[PDB]
Amino acid sequence: AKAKTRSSRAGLQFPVGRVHRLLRKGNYAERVGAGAPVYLAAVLEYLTAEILELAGNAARDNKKTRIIPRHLQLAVRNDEELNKLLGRVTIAQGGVLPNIQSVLLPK
Amino acid sequence: AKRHRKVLRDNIQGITKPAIRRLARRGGVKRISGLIYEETRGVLKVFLENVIRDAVTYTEHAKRKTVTAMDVVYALKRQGRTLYGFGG
Amino acid sequence: RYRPGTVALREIRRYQKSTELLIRKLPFQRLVREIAQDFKTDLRFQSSAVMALQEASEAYLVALFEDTNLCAIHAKRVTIMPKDIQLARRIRGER
Amino acid sequence: TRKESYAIYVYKVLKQVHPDTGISSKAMSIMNSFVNDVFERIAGEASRLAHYNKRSTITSREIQTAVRLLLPGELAKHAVSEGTKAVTKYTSA
Amino acid sequence: DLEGTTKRFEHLLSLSGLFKHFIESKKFRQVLDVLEENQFRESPAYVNGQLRPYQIQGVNWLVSLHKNKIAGILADEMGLGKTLQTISFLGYLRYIEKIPGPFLVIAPKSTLNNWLREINRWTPDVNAFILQGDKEERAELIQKKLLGCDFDVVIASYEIIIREKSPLKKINWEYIIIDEAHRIKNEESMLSQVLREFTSRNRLLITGTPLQNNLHELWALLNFLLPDIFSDAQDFDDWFSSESTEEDQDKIVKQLHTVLQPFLLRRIKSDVETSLLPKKELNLYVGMSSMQKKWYKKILEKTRLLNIMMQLRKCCNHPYLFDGAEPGPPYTTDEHLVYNAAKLQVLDKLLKKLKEEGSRVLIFSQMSRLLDILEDYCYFRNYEYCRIDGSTAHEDRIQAIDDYNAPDSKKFVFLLTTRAGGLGINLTSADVVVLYDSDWNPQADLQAMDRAHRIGQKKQVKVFRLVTDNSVEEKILERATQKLRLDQLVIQNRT
Ligand SMILES: Nc1ncnc2c1ncn2[C@@H]1O[C@H](COP(=O)(O)OP(=O)(O)O)[C@@H](O)[C@H]1O
Ligand SMILES: [Mg+2]
């Protein structure tokens, strides 16, 4: 019969066969269920969509039509939840968030 | 009388005073004392010592002689400063 | 000409906008080779490895300088000093 | 050669969310690394979670629990809701 | 396009069209499928001055190549007056053909002003507008002159053309010339890459050493002048039957003798009595020293001891370079330095044997650090010396060369490096040089010994070459030799 992928019949875009393959041959457990790849693909897709939307917002805020590591840095550090999740990472070529202490400004 | 290599400069002093000041400004400071330069050089040297030690350990385990960027990423993540962009 | 501090705020604005590298490339690369000499003789280094090392070092030093600046401001000052940087490192479980 | 990427899937999600933008190569590599890192975090937490309960099977229950343990605040809630939606749609279809 | 493209084909077939390999294999096949069915002998003075007899036919060769509309490389030897023979051709276009400008004078930074000096002395009333200087004086010079479309001769250095490309990219050109063209030998070199996009009718390349490293480099020169004709190295390198050595009976080489006949013009310094004196050589073999014998064995069997092959060349030169081989502190400059150097032991005696003869030795050494050992050894022997090595500015260089090239001068040993800048430096007031260390490229040492052998040299000049025994140097010299000998079998039998 004609074959349709688990990604399609699950509604997602991220791959489910690849996730299942990694979970199996990743020495995570002896035997792997049949809904875990779907759940993991859904979660990864959600996180990717969230950060990408914030990055696109920043990119258009700077009048540009291509997301760059600077915009990734800016979105991640301006959203507090993603900032906590990615608190310990350092996006390469991301620069720093603009900030000058109030005391340092002139009178 | 200069067959020997009497002329040479130290490597840690290659981290110039204005480079320290550029880092300081991006951090967001407004006035820098005179000893920040030496202290910063010391701190940077210690950090590099640790990271490079772990990276070299990885490379010599793998039976190689080149320290790869992915090995450096492994060492850095082990230290606990995961780095995004250089693969992995 | 300019009152003191004006150029300082100007440079802070300059350098918090940019994303470039701040330490020169070849001096840092030479330092990396020299400091890696002792652990094991005859190590090669590829450019991506050295670049990752420089990225990590710059990020570390920038965060350290933010912590030092906050320490200095806490003590009713605006100049940073080795006292400030030592306190900042030792309170982060490094010293 | 033949190195797996996630790049095409990231681009698909991008063209879904903002269908007029693009991604530079460095940004794409950063995003791929982010996906791999979060994947390995979730998988490791699920592995430890199954090992703690004398259980020898990764399944959706501890995938969900690992998601709830790692993602903070509203992220956990939204991700859990979306995961359950996807898995129920998959089993139904 | 095709009118010239076709016309060049049978013209190649016209004058000794013995190619018969790539003229037909080459998408020009269908273009030639249509045709498949089938003078200034007076030393002319339109440019001012008289031209010595053997220089004219080169110009007419350029004229004939222009009259046939094909690019060509001349291969006049150093000091033969390529400068005059170049500008004369441009005068031909300005006077006989009445086509003045535009043209480039792409040249090394050292000779930027030199050609303009020679340009006016045989052809005044010329539009020479050299583009050189800081970021500013160059910049406004672009609009008034380069963007003014009011020039005929444009002088700009290798570094300049890679900087001011955008102006010169826009400007159409007739001819483009590059002096000492061998820098175009890596076809992926960024300067060679840029010149691909320069619009011109034909190009002129000036050289004396076309073949230095391989025969692959020649095609890169050929890929520049006539990209359509050659357009490939597989038909040039491999088709030539592995440098025509293991599968030749002196026949395919005979083919290439006439294949690249109408493209090069190499005239010998033998046919003119300028130096009027043949050169001499020794290949003296140095018994390797004792402490070196320790190190060479130590390096082999397994401090930065990487790139083994050159490391062994350090041991073959002087063990004192290894940081520790010499006796420890305190440091003295005495005969103990001479013992631990197999070459210097031999070199020391010969340095004495020429002192009484009034000779002045011109040491050419690799690894400028090696000079420092010789410098202090020179200091030990109380010898008159001056140094001109890398990292010494030209004003320091010229005063240094004056000390050597002074009337009733007294300097005995004058240190250099195997490269030592451009050909321009004049060392004809000397009689002996020493190639203390050999080089991979024999041409890289060919012109270095031509530093002494240049024009005006009356007395015989003696050239040495120290060779370590049963070591790495043994294989390098034959590697240079066969690469050197490759030149004769390829070039040194046309003219
Ligand atoms: N017919 C001639 N009469 C007088 N002098 C000449 C003649 N031809 C060449 N010369 C001189 O010989 C010198 C040779 O220089 P040349 O080898 O062309 O320099 P480069 O090697 O930089 O091209 C020139 O400076 C020129 O002045
Ligand atoms: Mg010349």
Swiss-Prot record, chain B:
Core component of nucleosome. Nucleosomes wrap and compact DNA into chromatin, limiting DNA accessibility to the cellular machineries which require DNA as a template. Histones thereby play a central role in transcription regulation, DNA repair, DNA replication and chromosomal stability. DNA accessibility is regulated via a complex set of post-translational modifications of histones, also called histone code, and nucleosome remodeling. It is found in: Nucleus; Chromosome. The modification N6,N6-dimethyllysine is found at residue 6. There is a cross-link at residue 17 (Glycyl lysine isopeptide (Lys-Gly) (interchain with G-Cter in UFM1)). The keyword Ribonucleoprotein does not apply. The modification N6-methyllysine is found at residue 6. It comes from the Eukaryota. The modification Phosphotyrosine is found at residues 37, 74. GO terms for biological process: nucleosome assembly. The modification N6-propionyllysine is found at residues 2, 17, 30, 63, 65, 77. The modification N6-glutaryllysine is found at residues 17, 45, 63, 65, 77. This is Histone H4. The modification N6,N6,N6-trimethyllysine is found at residue 6. Residues 2-6 bind DNA. The modification N6-succinyllysine is found at residues 17, 63, 77. Keywords: Acetylation, Chromosome, Citrullination, DNA-binding, Hydroxylation, Isopeptide bond, Methylation, Nucleosome core, Nucleus, Phosphoprotein, Ubl conjugation. SMART domains: H4, TAF. The nucleosome is a histone octamer containing two molecules each of H2A, H2B, H3 and H4 assembled in one H3-H4 heterotetramer and two H2A-H2B heterodimers. The octamer wraps approximately 147 bp of DNA. One of its GO terms (molecular function) is protein heterodimerization activity. The modification N6-butyryllysine is found at residues 2, 17, 30, 63, 65, 77. Belongs to the histone H4 family. InterPro entries: CENP-T/H4_C (IPR035425), Histone-fold (IPR009072), Histone_H4 (IPR001951), Histone_H4_CS (IPR019809), TAF_TATA-bd_Histone-like_dom (IPR004823). It comes from Xenopus laevis (African clawed frog). The modification N6-methylated lysine is found at residue 6. There is a cross-link at residue 77 (Glycyl lysine isopeptide (Lys-Gly) (interchain with G-Cter in ubiquitin)).
UniProtKB/Swiss-Prot annotation, chain E:
Residues 346-495 form the Helicase C-terminal domain. Catalytic component of ISW1-type complexes, which act by remodeling the chromatin by catalyzing an ATP-dependent alteration in the structure of nucleosomal DNA. They are involved in coordinating transcriptional repression, activation and elongation phases. The ISW1A complex represses gene expression at initiation through specific positioning of a promoter proximal dinucleosome. The ISW1B complex acts within coding regions to control the amount of RNA polymerase II released into productive elongation and to coordinate elongation with termination and pre-mRNA processing. It is found in: Nucleus. This is ISWI chromatin-remodeling complex ATPase ISW1. Belongs to the SNF2/RAD54 helicase family. ISWI subfamily. Residues 63-228 form the Helicase ATP-binding domain. A motif (DEAH box) lies at residues 179-182. The chain holds residues 101 to 656 of 1129 of the full protein. It comes from the Eukaryota. Present with 1500 molecules/cell in log phase SD medium. Component of the ISW1A complex, which at least consists of ISW1 and IOC3. Component of the ISW1B complex, which at least consists of ISW1, IOC2 and IOC4. Disulfide bonds: none annotated. ATP binds at residues 76-83.
